[PDB]
Amino acid sequence: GLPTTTLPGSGQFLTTDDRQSPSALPNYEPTPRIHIPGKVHNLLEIIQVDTLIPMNNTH
Amino acid sequence: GLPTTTLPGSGQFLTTDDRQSPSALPNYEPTPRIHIPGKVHNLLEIIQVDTLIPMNNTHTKDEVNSYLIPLNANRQNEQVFGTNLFIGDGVFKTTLLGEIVQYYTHWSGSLRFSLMYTGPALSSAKLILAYTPPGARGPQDRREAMLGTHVVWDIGLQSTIVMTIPWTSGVQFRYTDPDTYTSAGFLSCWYQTSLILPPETTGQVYLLSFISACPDFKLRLMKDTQTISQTVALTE
Amino acid sequence: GLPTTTLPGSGQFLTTDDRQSPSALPNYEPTPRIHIPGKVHNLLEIIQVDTLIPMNNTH
Amino acid sequence: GYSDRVQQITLGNSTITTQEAANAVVCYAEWPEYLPDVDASDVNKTSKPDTSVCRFYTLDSKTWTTGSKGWCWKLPDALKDMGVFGQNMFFHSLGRSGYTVHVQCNATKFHSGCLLVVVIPEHQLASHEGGNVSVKYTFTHPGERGIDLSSANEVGGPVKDVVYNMNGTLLGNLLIFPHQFINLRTNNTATIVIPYINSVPIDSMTRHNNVSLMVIPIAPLTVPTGATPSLPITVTIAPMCTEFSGIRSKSIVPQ
Amino acid sequence: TVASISSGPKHTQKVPILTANETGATMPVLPSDSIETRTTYMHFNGSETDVECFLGRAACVHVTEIQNKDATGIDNHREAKLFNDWKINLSSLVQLRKKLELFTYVRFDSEYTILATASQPDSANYSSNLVVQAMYVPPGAPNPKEWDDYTWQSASNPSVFFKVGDTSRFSVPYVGLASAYNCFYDGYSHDDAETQYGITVLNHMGSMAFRIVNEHDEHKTLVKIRVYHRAKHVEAWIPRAPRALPYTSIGRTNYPKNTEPVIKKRKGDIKSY
Amino acid sequence: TVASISSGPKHTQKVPILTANETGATMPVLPSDSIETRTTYMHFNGSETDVECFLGRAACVHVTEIQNKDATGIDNHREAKLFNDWKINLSSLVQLRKKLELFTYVRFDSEYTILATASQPDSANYSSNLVVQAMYVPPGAPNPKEWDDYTWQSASNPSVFFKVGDTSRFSVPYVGLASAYNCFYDGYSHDDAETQYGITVLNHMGSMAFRIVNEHDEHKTLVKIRVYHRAKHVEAWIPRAPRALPYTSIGRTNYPKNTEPVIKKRKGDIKSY
Amino acid sequence: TVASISSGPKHTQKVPILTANETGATMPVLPSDSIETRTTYMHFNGSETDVECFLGR
Amino acid sequence: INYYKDAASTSSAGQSLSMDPSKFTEPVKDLMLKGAPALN
Amino acid sequence: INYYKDAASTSSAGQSLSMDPSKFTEPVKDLMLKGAPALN
Amino acid sequence: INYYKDAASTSSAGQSLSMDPSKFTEPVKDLMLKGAPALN
Ligand SMILES: Cc1cc(CCCCCOc2c(Cl)cc(C3=NCCO3)cc2Cl)on1
Ligand SMILES: Cc1cc(CCCCCOc2c(Cl)cc(C3=NCCO3)cc2Cl)on1
């Protein structure tokens, strides 16, 4: 038995933390990926495509 | 004392997790293993053995007779049997294949459907078996049937014919519990010419039919079977 | 602070488990061992010595 | 000119010839062999009567008729009275054996009918009473007579319902067990070689049967016109690699 | 790995699709023996159908119940559920049973999880905190007669003490007598004419006994124990036909009389789709 | 990395700012093509706009509720919330929905967190300690009819047992049928004339079922379940226009009638600032 | 480790089964001194009978 | 890392990755070749 | 350090650091050079 | 790994694997050979 101390924050759930978890479906094999045109990696990729501005807002 | 933090999920019991535990019987020595023929390693090993399909489901109480597909002498052009291919339900459901498929949520792969003929040796017959891939209705006459996957079977010395339902699918997995989007087709069988009995012989002859999975087959995402339930715990 | 998760069984006391514990008497020095004839290591050593059977149980 | 079709099995002082076989099955792809030391527990040297016990015993014949439901024999029970095999059986504390089973049924090219011949390791039968009624000893030790699945329920006996294999499983799935069909149109015999299958290296031959052989008509017998409506079925079985151990006084068993 | 190879038209004297099923074999026929195929790969290993995986998740094997109450004047603790027992068996619940009975002999270590929750069905000021004690009385061991016996001392008997609401967990080697557990047994204890039949005679590995360590408070507290079992290090021999009819008893194969047809009748013809 | 290079006066025949938008391209014009700039560096990587980051935080996807009470005389447990279910779907709540629908196909593993808190709206002596049991009934599985069925045995169904007030957590691989989850689907199950339309026909991955293991105490206890979902290992294809109108249904694109203008009207002229 | 060695018929002047218990010894006689045995291995170490194990729970 | 001394206490075993259906699908004594006649 | 066996159980992925808007901003068949006339 | 300083705090000892019954089963002064006569 190794001695430990727990710190403030133990047991909290922070929606933004990133940790490991047990898989509920041990050993399951996902469907293979096939190729699909159009993959997005960054939202910065798409905000460089121009779109129309409803400038004439007066309606 | 090393500082720690516990995460969400601490103390939970997940029936599917796999960790170490203390042994209650420290130092105990199990009985030696001896050799026993028959070891199974994968359920995929056993679903390749074929078993009989109660195709003739039309009875009213379970009987040996629902395994027998009858054949009539001298009929021409007509249809011997029909079934959809929901392997998790209907005729398939009690077969070993059907029975295992039901422990999983998704299946993919080819099926092997064979028919063994049992009529007198001096008789003869030519049958057509047809697989209709998803998208069309169960065929209504041989003309319709013969335009899809089919095998003309010539009854001979070689007693069985093995038809394969090759995996025809957009989506790479189908659900084992019957689902539309995911549906697999129909299987029908018709006289190609007709059964002919020798003299001094009469009546119906029967075909036995089996189902097993090709080596192609995949099953995934285990779950509980609708095939067994209970209302109180059993006692001795 | 290192992230941990506790499993089912935490806090249980199993009379058969074998772990480390803090010594209540830090630094104490036990009496030296001297030699004593007769040490037993296994119960298998002693069940090979024969003893009498009350076979005539009829009293 | 060898065919899968003709075969000869010579075992001891007895030989079988079939001119219309359909290959032969060897359970789980293993052939009977003696008990290796590495697997041994009892310290007794065993007795291997060899050719006096490893020969072919032909049990009494059955009659397949249009109403037959199927028959069931248990091993080593069925042989409990055959020659020196049987004596050895009652006289040693433990014994072990594999078998060659040869089921015979010939007809003509006008008959139809198809039997399933299957070997089930550890076939624990069910009581027809339900609940937790047991199946008495005598009932599961029919001897050479075997059990006739078309006989009536008896008290303390097993259930004899065929589409449930005498245990709550469907006839259709018996095909997962080593088996072979006899289809009058193809076949006239079935042969299965059974290796010894148990969770212990050697066991008692009287309190535990380790396989049931089952012959079940599946496509009903259909004879040519004005033929006699029945065929006999004969079962011949030969112990192979038999070993007996722990000799003594000679067991006395119920009934 | 290829799932299908490419194959084209055929006009041969070599017909892989005609066989003789009377032989007992299932000939390994593939789509490419009878239609023209294209190459495709498997992309899959069959990982989740391994028997270790199939029998390796926790299943509920037993639910029992004990209560904490004043034993004053109770002539039969066992009978007041002052403490109960579970005569270790895995045939009770049928969900895990059917799975196991797919094989004849099975060998594995067990991992047990025991969840205990409390109920206070009638007026209590509070919820007390009870500590459960699960002790395995090996056959041939002094069976607890009372709830604070000398047996509970369990000085040689493995025992675990955990809190209600909490879970206890440990794992046990395979404690089978033979080389493997007999899922079925077509024999008897001895050559008797009335002796029982089955495995119920083979599977006699004593029982587990639970009890609440705490004395009694003013109210009564119901504690319900659920035992979960997970097989680890699984080895299975000789596949059998799956169970079709319902179960009636621990350890016998018996099915109920006037059961219902298990094969679904067609709504229509043999010819129906 | 430079964010802007240095650039000076220009008097060319090479005009990077005149283009033809009819072509469908967005020409990569920069400040330095039309004013005189000085060098500046980016000092930034675009880390927090990665799709893994964008979809990778837990979002509340479902709130349900079950109660612990005496089931004696209840003819319909499901209906008494003796136990509820959530027919797994991520279209319920719109906060996470809009984010996901920025793409057409999406592929990811899920990490679920389940928080359970109890309420005792009417007179109780105390707060009991309940243990929740969340079991995923894969489609084609025996659906719990009661609250202590044989289904809850979940011997093959992944299930988790945690305490109310506490949280449960695990992660699931991508269990999609296809190569990716369809955020949109302009098709039907089959060529019918009445069959539904959308993804609601594609996203049929069973449901999750909750229940309280504990028996009933003297008072009643309301337990409210909140399921959170975090995508991990994200892959997204084909960006689409963001959702402008409100949502009306899980799985259809339908917007409400007589909705309100979504573009803010100017308070003034086109010329207004 | 062998639990029993193989041993066959004996007709000797060397009798391991006759002893004098008055001496206080327990002579180490085995099955193979008085019946014909076959080889078998122990498959076991005697781990759980160690005194540390016996008094250690 | 095993934290415990006994083998029973270790986690689940790891995939057989054995797989050989022939003991079940082709237990025939004389070998059958696909394509050759079943009965000669 | 992964403590778990399955890949789904690992933490979040790590930044694509891929980034190539041209499939979206310039999907034209004949390449357009900035500075050259749009339509020739 | 011992986490503690004192020896008493370590776990159980490990199997003697000593085993020698002769101090108990054959404490005779003149050695007895099995097979030779007990009393000469
Ligand atoms: C087949 C088959 C397999 C089994 C399992 C038998 C269980 C063996 C004994 O298992 C236990 C041990 Cl060794 C210890 C404890 C225990 N120690 C402290 C608390 O409980 C409980 C059990 Cl069930 O039953 N039929
Ligand atoms: C698009 C899209 C993606 C999803 C998610 C589908 C969820 C798949 C199934 O997920 C679960 C699994 Cl595998 C297990 C459990 C579970 N195991 C024990 C308790 O809960 C719960 C869920 Cl939601 O839905 N639409």
JSON list of C-alpha atoms in Angstrom, two decimals, chain B residues 86-233:
[
{"chain": "B", "resi": 86, "resn": "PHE", "atom": "CA", "xyz": [-33.44, -11.49, -41.15]},
{"chain": "B", "resi": 87, "resn": "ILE", "atom": "CA", "xyz": [-30.94, -13.91, -39.61]},
{"chain": "B", "resi": 88, "resn": "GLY", "atom": "CA", "xyz": [-31.94, -12.79, -36.14]},
{"chain": "B", "resi": 89, "resn": "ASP", "atom": "CA", "xyz": [-35.59, -13.68, -36.49]},
{"chain": "B", "resi": 90, "resn": "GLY", "atom": "CA", "xyz": [-38.07, -16.01, -38.11]},
{"chain": "B", "resi": 91, "resn": "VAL", "atom": "CA", "xyz": [-36.73, -19.32, -39.52]},
{"chain": "B", "resi": 92, "resn": "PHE", "atom": "CA", "xyz": [-33.10, -18.47, -38.70]},
{"chain": "B", "resi": 93, "resn": "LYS", "atom": "CA", "xyz": [-33.71, -17.53, -35.14]},
{"chain": "B", "resi": 94, "resn": "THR", "atom": "CA", "xyz": [-33.37, -20.94, -33.40]},
{"chain": "B", "resi": 95, "resn": "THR", "atom": "CA", "xyz": [-30.49, -22.16, -35.53]},
{"chain": "B", "resi": 96, "resn": "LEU", "atom": "CA", "xyz": [-27.02, -21.99, -33.94]},
{"chain": "B", "resi": 97, "resn": "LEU", "atom": "CA", "xyz": [-26.15, -19.13, -36.28]},
{"chain": "B", "resi": 98, "resn": "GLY", "atom": "CA", "xyz": [-29.33, -17.28, -35.43]},
{"chain": "B", "resi": 99, "resn": "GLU", "atom": "CA", "xyz": [-28.80, -18.04, -31.77]},
{"chain": "B", "resi": 100, "resn": "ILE", "atom": "CA", "xyz": [-25.27, -16.56, -31.65]},
{"chain": "B", "resi": 101, "resn": "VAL", "atom": "CA", "xyz": [-25.97, -13.57, -33.87]},
{"chain": "B", "resi": 102, "resn": "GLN", "atom": "CA", "xyz": [-28.44, -12.60, -31.19]},
{"chain": "B", "resi": 103, "resn": "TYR", "atom": "CA", "xyz": [-25.61, -12.11, -28.68]},
{"chain": "B", "resi": 104, "resn": "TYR", "atom": "CA", "xyz": [-24.30, -9.30, -30.91]},
{"chain": "B", "resi": 105, "resn": "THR", "atom": "CA", "xyz": [-25.71, -6.08, -32.26]},
{"chain": "B", "resi": 106, "resn": "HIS", "atom": "CA", "xyz": [-24.17, -5.89, -35.77]},
{"chain": "B", "resi": 107, "resn": "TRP", "atom": "CA", "xyz": [-23.19, -8.59, -38.30]},
{"chain": "B", "resi": 108, "resn": "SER", "atom": "CA", "xyz": [-21.52, -8.41, -41.72]},
{"chain": "B", "resi": 109, "resn": "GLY", "atom": "CA", "xyz": [-20.36, -11.22, -44.03]},
{"chain": "B", "resi": 110, "resn": "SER", "atom": "CA", "xyz": [-21.40, -14.01, -46.36]},
{"chain": "B", "resi": 111, "resn": "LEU", "atom": "CA", "xyz": [-23.86, -16.78, -45.40]},
{"chain": "B", "resi": 112, "resn": "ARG", "atom": "CA", "xyz": [-23.77, -20.31, -46.69]},
{"chain": "B", "resi": 113, "resn": "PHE", "atom": "CA", "xyz": [-27.22, -21.87, -47.36]},
{"chain": "B", "resi": 114, "resn": "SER", "atom": "CA", "xyz": [-27.17, -25.54, -48.53]},
{"chain": "B", "resi": 115, "resn": "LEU", "atom": "CA", "xyz": [-29.98, -28.02, -49.31]},
{"chain": "B", "resi": 116, "resn": "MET", "atom": "CA", "xyz": [-29.46, -31.82, -49.01]},
{"chain": "B", "resi": 117, "resn": "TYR", "atom": "CA", "xyz": [-31.90, -33.93, -51.13]},
{"chain": "B", "resi": 118, "resn": "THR", "atom": "CA", "xyz": [-33.44, -37.07, -49.55]},
{"chain": "B", "resi": 119, "resn": "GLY", "atom": "CA", "xyz": [-35.67, -38.52, -52.37]},
{"chain": "B", "resi": 120, "resn": "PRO", "atom": "CA", "xyz": [-35.24, -42.05, -53.75]},
{"chain": "B", "resi": 121, "resn": "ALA", "atom": "CA", "xyz": [-32.00, -42.54, -55.61]},
{"chain": "B", "resi": 122, "resn": "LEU", "atom": "CA", "xyz": [-33.86, -43.36, -58.93]},
{"chain": "B", "resi": 123, "resn": "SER", "atom": "CA", "xyz": [-35.64, -39.96, -58.99]},
{"chain": "B", "resi": 124, "resn": "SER", "atom": "CA", "xyz": [-34.26, -36.72, -60.47]},
{"chain": "B", "resi": 125, "resn": "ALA", "atom": "CA", "xyz": [-34.95, -32.99, -60.20]},
{"chain": "B", "resi": 126, "resn": "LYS", "atom": "CA", "xyz": [-33.54, -29.57, -61.14]},
{"chain": "B", "resi": 127, "resn": "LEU", "atom": "CA", "xyz": [-34.17, -26.66, -58.77]},
{"chain": "B", "resi": 128, "resn": "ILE", "atom": "CA", "xyz": [-33.08, -23.01, -58.90]},
{"chain": "B", "resi": 129, "resn": "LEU", "atom": "CA", "xyz": [-32.18, -21.17, -55.66]},
{"chain": "B", "resi": 130, "resn": "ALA", "atom": "CA", "xyz": [-32.18, -17.36, -55.92]},
{"chain": "B", "resi": 131, "resn": "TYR", "atom": "CA", "xyz": [-30.85, -14.66, -53.56]},
{"chain": "B", "resi": 132, "resn": "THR", "atom": "CA", "xyz": [-32.56, -11.24, -54.18]},
{"chain": "B", "resi": 133, "resn": "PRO", "atom": "CA", "xyz": [-30.41, -8.33, -52.89]},
{"chain": "B", "resi": 134, "resn": "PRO", "atom": "CA", "xyz": [-32.07, -5.56, -50.89]},
{"chain": "B", "resi": 135, "resn": "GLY", "atom": "CA", "xyz": [-34.13, -3.12, -52.90]},
{"chain": "B", "resi": 136, "resn": "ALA", "atom": "CA", "xyz": [-36.56, -5.36, -54.79]},
{"chain": "B", "resi": 137, "resn": "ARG", "atom": "CA", "xyz": [-39.52, -7.38, -53.43]},
{"chain": "B", "resi": 138, "resn": "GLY", "atom": "CA", "xyz": [-39.44, -11.15, -52.73]},
{"chain": "B", "resi": 139, "resn": "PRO", "atom": "CA", "xyz": [-39.62, -12.52, -56.30]},
{"chain": "B", "resi": 140, "resn": "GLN", "atom": "CA", "xyz": [-43.03, -13.62, -57.40]},
{"chain": "B", "resi": 141, "resn": "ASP", "atom": "CA", "xyz": [-42.17, -16.09, -60.18]},
{"chain": "B", "resi": 142, "resn": "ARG", "atom": "CA", "xyz": [-38.89, -17.70, -61.34]},
{"chain": "B", "resi": 143, "resn": "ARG", "atom": "CA", "xyz": [-38.51, -15.18, -64.10]},
{"chain": "B", "resi": 144, "resn": "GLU", "atom": "CA", "xyz": [-38.30, -12.54, -61.53]},
{"chain": "B", "resi": 145, "resn": "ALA", "atom": "CA", "xyz": [-36.17, -14.75, -59.30]},
{"chain": "B", "resi": 146, "resn": "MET", "atom": "CA", "xyz": [-33.64, -15.84, -61.91]},
{"chain": "B", "resi": 147, "resn": "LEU", "atom": "CA", "xyz": [-32.45, -12.23, -62.55]},
{"chain": "B", "resi": 148, "resn": "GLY", "atom": "CA", "xyz": [-30.57, -12.07, -59.19]},
{"chain": "B", "resi": 149, "resn": "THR", "atom": "CA", "xyz": [-28.02, -14.39, -57.52]},
{"chain": "B", "resi": 150, "resn": "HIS", "atom": "CA", "xyz": [-29.03, -17.94, -58.34]},
{"chain": "B", "resi": 151, "resn": "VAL", "atom": "CA", "xyz": [-27.67, -21.52, -58.79]},
{"chain": "B", "resi": 152, "resn": "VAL", "atom": "CA", "xyz": [-29.38, -24.20, -60.96]},
{"chain": "B", "resi": 153, "resn": "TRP", "atom": "CA", "xyz": [-29.01, -27.29, -58.75]},
{"chain": "B", "resi": 154, "resn": "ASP", "atom": "CA", "xyz": [-29.03, -30.67, -60.58]},
{"chain": "B", "resi": 155, "resn": "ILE", "atom": "CA", "xyz": [-29.96, -33.47, -58.09]},
{"chain": "B", "resi": 156, "resn": "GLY", "atom": "CA", "xyz": [-27.45, -36.22, -58.44]},
{"chain": "B", "resi": 157, "resn": "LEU", "atom": "CA", "xyz": [-25.02, -38.51, -56.76]},
{"chain": "B", "resi": 158, "resn": "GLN", "atom": "CA", "xyz": [-23.69, -35.51, -54.89]},
{"chain": "B", "resi": 159, "resn": "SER", "atom": "CA", "xyz": [-26.54, -34.99, -52.51]},
{"chain": "B", "resi": 160, "resn": "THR", "atom": "CA", "xyz": [-26.07, -31.39, -51.25]},
{"chain": "B", "resi": 161, "resn": "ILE", "atom": "CA", "xyz": [-25.78, -28.03, -52.95]},
{"chain": "B", "resi": 162, "resn": "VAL", "atom": "CA", "xyz": [-24.16, -25.09, -51.18]},
{"chain": "B", "resi": 163, "resn": "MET", "atom": "CA", "xyz": [-25.47, -21.68, -52.14]},
{"chain": "B", "resi": 164, "resn": "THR", "atom": "CA", "xyz": [-23.59, -18.63, -50.75]},
{"chain": "B", "resi": 165, "resn": "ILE", "atom": "CA", "xyz": [-25.48, -15.35, -50.10]},
{"chain": "B", "resi": 166, "resn": "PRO", "atom": "CA", "xyz": [-22.55, -13.07, -50.96]},
{"chain": "B", "resi": 167, "resn": "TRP", "atom": "CA", "xyz": [-22.41, -9.90, -48.86]},
{"chain": "B", "resi": 168, "resn": "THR", "atom": "CA", "xyz": [-24.29, -7.32, -50.97]},
{"chain": "B", "resi": 169, "resn": "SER", "atom": "CA", "xyz": [-24.42, -4.04, -49.10]},
{"chain": "B", "resi": 170, "resn": "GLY", "atom": "CA", "xyz": [-23.93, -0.30, -49.12]},
{"chain": "B", "resi": 171, "resn": "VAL", "atom": "CA", "xyz": [-23.42, 0.07, -45.32]},
{"chain": "B", "resi": 172, "resn": "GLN", "atom": "CA", "xyz": [-20.76, -2.34, -44.03]},
{"chain": "B", "resi": 173, "resn": "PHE", "atom": "CA", "xyz": [-22.75, -3.65, -41.07]},
{"chain": "B", "resi": 174, "resn": "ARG", "atom": "CA", "xyz": [-26.39, -4.57, -40.63]},
{"chain": "B", "resi": 175, "resn": "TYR", "atom": "CA", "xyz": [-28.26, -4.84, -37.36]},
{"chain": "B", "resi": 176, "resn": "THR", "atom": "CA", "xyz": [-29.04, -8.52, -36.20]},
{"chain": "B", "resi": 177, "resn": "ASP", "atom": "CA", "xyz": [-32.47, -7.45, -34.89]},
{"chain": "B", "resi": 178, "resn": "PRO", "atom": "CA", "xyz": [-34.55, -6.84, -38.01]},
{"chain": "B", "resi": 179, "resn": "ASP", "atom": "CA", "xyz": [-34.23, -3.34, -39.35]},
{"chain": "B", "resi": 180, "resn": "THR", "atom": "CA", "xyz": [-35.31, -1.85, -42.67]},
{"chain": "B", "resi": 181, "resn": "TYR", "atom": "CA", "xyz": [-32.51, 0.37, -43.81]},
{"chain": "B", "resi": 182, "resn": "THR", "atom": "CA", "xyz": [-30.23, -2.47, -42.90]},
{"chain": "B", "resi": 183, "resn": "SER", "atom": "CA", "xyz": [-32.28, -5.27, -44.52]},
{"chain": "B", "resi": 184, "resn": "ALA", "atom": "CA", "xyz": [-30.61, -8.07, -46.49]},
{"chain": "B", "resi": 185, "resn": "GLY", "atom": "CA", "xyz": [-32.90, -9.46, -49.21]},
{"chain": "B", "resi": 186, "resn": "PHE", "atom": "CA", "xyz": [-34.87, -12.59, -49.86]},
{"chain": "B", "resi": 187, "resn": "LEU", "atom": "CA", "xyz": [-34.08, -16.21, -50.65]},
{"chain": "B", "resi": 188, "resn": "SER", "atom": "CA", "xyz": [-36.50, -18.23, -52.86]},
{"chain": "B", "resi": 189, "resn": "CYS", "atom": "CA", "xyz": [-36.35, -21.68, -54.61]},
{"chain": "B", "resi": 190, "resn": "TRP", "atom": "CA", "xyz": [-38.40, -22.89, -57.67]},
{"chain": "B", "resi": 191, "resn": "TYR", "atom": "CA", "xyz": [-38.60, -25.98, -59.89]},
{"chain": "B", "resi": 192, "resn": "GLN", "atom": "CA", "xyz": [-36.14, -25.49, -62.80]},
{"chain": "B", "resi": 193, "resn": "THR", "atom": "CA", "xyz": [-37.55, -28.48, -64.59]},
{"chain": "B", "resi": 194, "resn": "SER", "atom": "CA", "xyz": [-39.41, -30.63, -62.01]},
{"chain": "B", "resi": 195, "resn": "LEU", "atom": "CA", "xyz": [-39.07, -33.58, -59.59]},
{"chain": "B", "resi": 196, "resn": "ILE", "atom": "CA", "xyz": [-39.67, -36.99, -61.31]},
{"chain": "B", "resi": 197, "resn": "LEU", "atom": "CA", "xyz": [-40.16, -40.17, -59.18]},
{"chain": "B", "resi": 198, "resn": "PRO", "atom": "CA", "xyz": [-39.32, -43.65, -60.47]},
{"chain": "B", "resi": 199, "resn": "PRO", "atom": "CA", "xyz": [-42.05, -46.23, -60.91]},
{"chain": "B", "resi": 200, "resn": "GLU", "atom": "CA", "xyz": [-43.41, -48.00, -57.84]},
{"chain": "B", "resi": 201, "resn": "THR", "atom": "CA", "xyz": [-42.76, -44.85, -55.87]},
{"chain": "B", "resi": 202, "resn": "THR", "atom": "CA", "xyz": [-45.02, -42.17, -54.54]},
{"chain": "B", "resi": 203, "resn": "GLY", "atom": "CA", "xyz": [-45.75, -39.07, -52.61]},
{"chain": "B", "resi": 204, "resn": "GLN", "atom": "CA", "xyz": [-43.67, -36.20, -51.33]},
{"chain": "B", "resi": 205, "resn": "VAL", "atom": "CA", "xyz": [-39.87, -36.13, -51.05]},
{"chain": "B", "resi": 206, "resn": "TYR", "atom": "CA", "xyz": [-38.14, -33.66, -48.72]},
{"chain": "B", "resi": 207, "resn": "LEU", "atom": "CA", "xyz": [-35.10, -31.42, -48.76]},
{"chain": "B", "resi": 208, "resn": "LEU", "atom": "CA", "xyz": [-33.24, -30.70, -45.48]},
{"chain": "B", "resi": 209, "resn": "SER", "atom": "CA", "xyz": [-31.73, -27.16, -45.40]},
{"chain": "B", "resi": 210, "resn": "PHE", "atom": "CA", "xyz": [-28.73, -25.91, -43.37]},
{"chain": "B", "resi": 211, "resn": "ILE", "atom": "CA", "xyz": [-27.24, -22.48, -42.53]},
{"chain": "B", "resi": 212, "resn": "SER", "atom": "CA", "xyz": [-23.68, -21.54, -41.42]},
{"chain": "B", "resi": 213, "resn": "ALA", "atom": "CA", "xyz": [-21.53, -18.39, -41.84]},
{"chain": "B", "resi": 214, "resn": "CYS", "atom": "CA", "xyz": [-18.65, -17.97, -44.33]},
{"chain": "B", "resi": 215, "resn": "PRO", "atom": "CA", "xyz": [-15.16, -17.18, -43.03]},
{"chain": "B", "resi": 216, "resn": "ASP", "atom": "CA", "xyz": [-15.98, -13.63, -44.18]},
{"chain": "B", "resi": 217, "resn": "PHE", "atom": "CA", "xyz": [-18.32, -13.04, -41.27]},
{"chain": "B", "resi": 218, "resn": "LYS", "atom": "CA", "xyz": [-18.01, -10.39, -38.54]},
{"chain": "B", "resi": 219, "resn": "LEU", "atom": "CA", "xyz": [-20.23, -9.93, -35.44]},
{"chain": "B", "resi": 220, "resn": "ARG", "atom": "CA", "xyz": [-19.69, -7.02, -33.00]},
{"chain": "B", "resi": 221, "resn": "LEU", "atom": "CA", "xyz": [-21.05, -5.10, -30.02]},
{"chain": "B", "resi": 222, "resn": "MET", "atom": "CA", "xyz": [-22.21, -7.76, -27.58]},
{"chain": "B", "resi": 223, "resn": "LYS", "atom": "CA", "xyz": [-25.56, -7.51, -25.90]},
{"chain": "B", "resi": 224, "resn": "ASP", "atom": "CA", "xyz": [-28.23, -9.61, -24.21]},
{"chain": "B", "resi": 225, "resn": "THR", "atom": "CA", "xyz": [-30.36, -12.14, -26.10]},
{"chain": "B", "resi": 226, "resn": "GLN", "atom": "CA", "xyz": [-34.10, -11.89, -26.38]},
{"chain": "B", "resi": 227, "resn": "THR", "atom": "CA", "xyz": [-33.99, -15.67, -26.43]},
{"chain": "B", "resi": 228, "resn": "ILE", "atom": "CA", "xyz": [-34.03, -16.29, -22.66]},
{"chain": "B", "resi": 229, "resn": "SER", "atom": "CA", "xyz": [-35.65, -14.72, -19.62]},
{"chain": "B", "resi": 230, "resn": "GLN", "atom": "CA", "xyz": [-37.01, -15.63, -16.20]},
{"chain": "B", "resi": 231, "resn": "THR", "atom": "CA", "xyz": [-39.38, -14.49, -13.51]},
{"chain": "B", "resi": 232, "resn": "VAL", "atom": "CA", "xyz": [-37.91, -15.81, -10.22]},
{"chain": "B", "resi": 233, "resn": "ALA", "atom": "CA", "xyz": [-34.45, -17.04, -9.37]}
]
